[PDB]
Motif scaffolding. Structure first.
Motif, PDB file in Angstrom:
ATOM      1  N   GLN B  22      -6.131  11.391  -7.992  1.00  0.00           N
ATOM      2  CA  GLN B  22      -5.686  12.737  -7.925  1.00  0.00           C
ATOM      3  C   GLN B  22      -6.009  13.363  -9.301  1.00  0.00           C
ATOM      4  OE1 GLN B  22      -1.843  13.563  -5.813  1.00  0.00           O
ATOM      5  NE2 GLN B  22      -1.890  11.383  -5.930  1.00  0.00           N
ATOM      6  N   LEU B  23      -5.839  12.353 -10.495  1.00  0.00           N
ATOM      7  CA  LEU B  23      -6.221  12.686 -11.631  1.00  0.00           C
ATOM      8  C   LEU B  23      -7.561  12.991 -11.997  1.00  0.00           C
ATOM      9  CD1 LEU B  23      -5.518  13.207 -14.834  1.00  0.00           C
ATOM     10  CD2 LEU B  23      -5.931  10.971 -14.979  1.00  0.00           C
ATOM     11  N   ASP B  24      -8.568  12.473 -11.353  1.00  0.00           N
ATOM     12  CA  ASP B  24      -9.888  12.892 -11.193  1.00  0.00           C
ATOM     13  C   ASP B  24     -10.110  14.077 -10.640  1.00  0.00           C
ATOM     14  OD1 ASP B  24     -10.567  10.229 -12.242  1.00  0.00           O
ATOM     15  OD2 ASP B  24     -10.681   9.410 -10.310  1.00  0.00           O
ATOM     16  N   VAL B  25      -9.355  14.441  -9.631  1.00  0.00           N
ATOM     17  CA  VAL B  25      -9.373  15.830  -8.958  1.00  0.00           C
ATOM     18  C   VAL B  25      -8.955  16.895  -9.857  1.00  0.00           C
ATOM     19  CG1 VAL B  25      -8.390  17.055  -7.298  1.00  0.00           C
ATOM     20  CG2 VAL B  25      -8.893  14.733  -6.631  1.00  0.00           C
ATOM     21  N   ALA B  26      -7.976  16.648 -10.500  1.00  0.00           N
ATOM     22  CA  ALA B  26      -7.758  17.730 -11.694  1.00  0.00           C
ATOM     23  C   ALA B  26      -8.466  17.851 -12.703  1.00  0.00           C
ATOM     24  CB  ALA B  26      -6.641  17.330 -12.309  1.00  0.00           C
ATOM     25  N   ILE B  27      -9.202  16.777 -13.148  1.00  0.00           N
ATOM     26  CA  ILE B  27     -10.465  16.700 -14.296  1.00  0.00           C
ATOM     27  C   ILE B  27     -11.602  17.518 -13.747  1.00  0.00           C
ATOM     28  CG2 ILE B  27     -11.919  15.635 -15.411  1.00  0.00           C
ATOM     29  CD1 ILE B  27      -9.652  13.232 -15.642  1.00  0.00           C
ATOM     30  N   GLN B  28     -12.003  17.335 -12.562  1.00  0.00           N
ATOM     31  CA  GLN B  28     -13.021  18.054 -12.018  1.00  0.00           C
ATOM     32  C   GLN B  28     -12.698  19.744 -11.901  1.00  0.00           C
ATOM     33  OE1 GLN B  28     -15.158  14.753 -12.517  1.00  0.00           O
ATOM     34  NE2 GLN B  28     -15.942  16.838 -11.921  1.00  0.00           N
ATOM     35  N   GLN B  29     -11.473  19.953 -11.442  1.00  0.00           N
ATOM     36  CA  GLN B  29     -11.312  21.327 -11.285  1.00  0.00           C
ATOM     37  C   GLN B  29     -11.599  21.926 -12.508  1.00  0.00           C
ATOM     38  OE1 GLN B  29      -7.399  21.867  -9.809  1.00  0.00           O
ATOM     39  NE2 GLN B  29      -7.976  21.529  -7.585  1.00  0.00           N
ATOM     40  N   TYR B  30     -10.881  21.315 -13.873  1.00  0.00           N
ATOM     41  CA  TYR B  30     -11.005  21.739 -15.127  1.00  0.00           C
ATOM     42  C   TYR B  30     -12.558  21.850 -15.506  1.00  0.00           C
ATOM     43  CZ  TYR B  30     -11.303  21.493 -20.087  1.00  0.00           C
ATOM     44  OH  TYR B  30     -11.623  21.894 -21.543  1.00  0.00           O
ATOM     45  N   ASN B  31     -13.413  20.871 -15.133  1.00  0.00           N
ATOM     46  CA  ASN B  31     -14.928  20.906 -15.460  1.00  0.00           C
ATOM     47  C   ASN B  31     -15.349  21.988 -14.943  1.00  0.00           C
ATOM     48  OD1 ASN B  31     -14.818  18.927 -17.467  1.00  0.00           O
ATOM     49  ND2 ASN B  31     -15.406  17.338 -15.953  1.00  0.00           N
ATOM     50  N   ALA B  32     -15.003  22.398 -13.548  1.00  0.00           N
ATOM     51  CA  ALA B  32     -15.554  23.540 -12.847  1.00  0.00           C
ATOM     52  C   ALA B  32     -15.187  24.801 -13.434  1.00  0.00           C
ATOM     53  CB  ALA B  32     -15.345  23.389 -11.281  1.00  0.00           C
ATOM     54  N   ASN B  33     -14.017  24.987 -13.962  1.00  0.00           N
ATOM     55  CA  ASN B  33     -13.676  26.209 -14.490  1.00  0.00           C
ATOM     56  C   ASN B  33     -14.279  26.339 -15.870  1.00  0.00           C
ATOM     57  OD1 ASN B  33     -12.469  28.638 -15.737  1.00  0.00           O
ATOM     58  ND2 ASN B  33     -10.749  27.604 -16.423  1.00  0.00           N
ATOM     59  N   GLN B  34     -14.597  25.212 -16.552  1.00  0.00           N
ATOM     60  CA  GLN B  34     -15.170  25.283 -18.071  1.00  0.00           C
ATOM     61  C   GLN B  34     -16.789  25.726 -18.142  1.00  0.00           C
ATOM     62  OE1 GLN B  34     -14.446  25.831 -20.724  1.00  0.00           O
ATOM     63  NE2 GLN B  34     -15.259  24.647 -22.495  1.00  0.00           N
ATOM     64  N   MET B  36     -18.247  27.710 -16.564  1.00  0.00           N
ATOM     65  CA  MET B  36     -18.857  29.167 -16.533  1.00  0.00           C
ATOM     66  C   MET B  36     -18.550  29.914 -17.824  1.00  0.00           C
ATOM     67  SD  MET B  36     -17.822  32.017 -13.765  1.00  0.00           S
ATOM     68  CE  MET B  36     -18.842  31.556 -12.651  1.00  0.00           C
ATOM     69  N   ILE B  37     -18.135  29.111 -18.770  1.00  0.00           N
ATOM     70  CA  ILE B  37     -17.692  29.555 -20.207  1.00  0.00           C
ATOM     71  C   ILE B  37     -18.498  28.791 -21.202  1.00  0.00           C
ATOM     72  CG2 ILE B  37     -15.891  30.175 -21.977  1.00  0.00           C
ATOM     73  CD1 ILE B  37     -15.909  31.665 -19.582  1.00  0.00           C
ATOM     74  N   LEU B  38     -18.831  27.638 -21.363  1.00  0.00           N
ATOM     75  CA  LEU B  38     -19.483  26.872 -22.161  1.00  0.00           C
ATOM     76  C   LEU B  38     -19.238  26.787 -23.415  1.00  0.00           C
ATOM     77  CD1 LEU B  38     -23.162  27.395 -20.515  1.00  0.00           C
ATOM     78  CD2 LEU B  38     -21.595  25.626 -20.043  1.00  0.00           C
ATOM     79  N   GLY B  39     -17.859  27.356 -23.745  1.00  0.00           N
ATOM     80  CA  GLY B  39     -17.710  27.153 -25.251  1.00  0.00           C
ATOM     81  C   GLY B  39     -18.371  27.960 -26.251  1.00  0.00           C
ATOM     82  N   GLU B  43     -17.977  37.602 -27.695  1.00  0.00           N
ATOM     83  CA  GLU B  43     -18.854  38.753 -27.739  1.00  0.00           C
ATOM     84  C   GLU B  43     -20.300  38.371 -27.161  1.00  0.00           C
ATOM     85  OE1 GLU B  43     -18.339  37.041 -30.759  1.00  0.00           O
ATOM     86  OE2 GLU B  43     -16.345  38.008 -31.401  1.00  0.00           O
ATOM     87  N   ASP B  44     -20.467  37.110 -27.009  1.00  0.00           N
ATOM     88  CA  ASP B  44     -22.074  36.663 -26.538  1.00  0.00           C
ATOM     89  C   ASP B  44     -21.830  36.321 -24.899  1.00  0.00           C
ATOM     90  OD1 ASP B  44     -23.095  37.105 -29.026  1.00  0.00           O
ATOM     91  OD2 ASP B  44     -22.553  34.994 -29.668  1.00  0.00           O
ATOM     92  N   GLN B  45     -20.784  36.433 -24.176  1.00  0.00           N
ATOM     93  CA  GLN B  45     -20.871  35.940 -22.950  1.00  0.00           C
ATOM     94  C   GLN B  45     -21.598  36.993 -22.001  1.00  0.00           C
ATOM     95  OE1 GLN B  45     -19.020  33.499 -22.113  1.00  0.00           O
ATOM     96  NE2 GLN B  45     -17.710  33.101 -23.654  1.00  0.00           N
ATOM     97  N   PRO B  46     -22.071  36.493 -21.073  1.00  0.00           N
ATOM     98  CA  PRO B  46     -23.192  37.156 -20.348  1.00  0.00           C
ATOM     99  C   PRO B  46     -22.753  38.715 -19.884  1.00  0.00           C
ATOM    100  CG  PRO B  46     -23.315  35.023 -19.670  1.00  0.00           C
ATOM    101  CD  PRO B  46     -22.116  34.854 -20.553  1.00  0.00           C
ATOM    102  N   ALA B  47     -21.564  39.007 -19.300  1.00  0.00           N
ATOM    103  CA  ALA B  47     -21.135  39.782 -18.826  1.00  0.00           C
ATOM    104  C   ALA B  47     -21.042  40.966 -19.818  1.00  0.00           C
ATOM    105  CB  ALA B  47     -19.725  39.578 -17.859  1.00  0.00           C
ATOM    106  N   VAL B  48     -20.555  40.597 -20.824  1.00  0.00           N
ATOM    107  CA  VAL B  48     -20.400  41.389 -22.007  1.00  0.00           C
ATOM    108  C   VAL B  48     -21.611  42.151 -22.441  1.00  0.00           C
ATOM    109  CG1 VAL B  48     -19.141  41.857 -24.462  1.00  0.00           C
ATOM    110  CG2 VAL B  48     -18.113  40.078 -22.654  1.00  0.00           C
TER     111      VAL B  48
END
Lengths: 50, 50, 50, 50
Positions: B22-34, B36-39, B43-48
């Motif tokens: 289950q911890l692996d599940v949560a980590i993968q969720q976090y990675n999937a959200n991250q 799309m932002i890539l740190g 101001e340099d995000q594609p949508a902006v």
């Protein structure tokens, strides 16, 4: 005595399968010995009453 | 030392494995959200820029 | 008198079995406390039973 | 050996069958969302080429 022997059989089988600890087997063995002693006392009392 | 039933230990180890999964599940969720932002900078995000 | 001697033998066997069972329970309770799964009241109760 | 009730064994078999069904559900959930990621390489995916 019959009932307690069946109880001990069940508990020992269950411990062998891997569902109970050794501590529960000792309780069944002790109860079996106690009922054995009670039966011996009952037989002796019948003899003495005769 | 044989002071506990085996089924209890099997259950404990199973619980540890399930928690790790289950911890692996949560980590993968976090990675999937991250992903799309890539740190980068806000101001340099594609949508902006779009 | 003869029957009484026999009854005494049987009772001795029963009590030895009970002692062994109590010792096993005390060992279990003490190990649990050492690993931190049990209080010290349980240890004292096991000692009293032994 | 005729030790435990029959409703206990029935409930064990039912649990195993239900667990198998749930694992099938999970496998199917995985198989879908693998149809989107058929292409091995990220640069070759249909969305990116558009």
């Amino acid at each position: 005595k019959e009932a307690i022997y069946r109880q001990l059989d069940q508990t020992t089988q269950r411990f062998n399968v891997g569902l109970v600890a050794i501590t529960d087997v000792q309780n069944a063995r002790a109860q079996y010995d106690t009922v054995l002693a009670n039966e011996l006392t009952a037989r002796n009392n019948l003899d003495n009453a005769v | 030392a044989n002071l506990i039933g085996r089924e209890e230990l099997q259950h404990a180890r199973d619980a540890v494995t399930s928690a790790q999964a289950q911890l692996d599940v949560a980590i993968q969720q976090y990675n999937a959200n991250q992903a799309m932002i890539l740190g980068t900078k806000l101001e340099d995000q594609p949508a902006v820029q779009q | 008198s003869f029957n009484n001697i026999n009854a005494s033998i049987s009772s001795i066997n029963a009590y030895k079995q009970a002692v062994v069972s109590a010792q096993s329970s005390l060992d279990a309770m003490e190990a649990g406390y050492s690993v931190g799964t049990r209080t010290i009241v349980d240890v004292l109760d096991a000692t009293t039973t032994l």
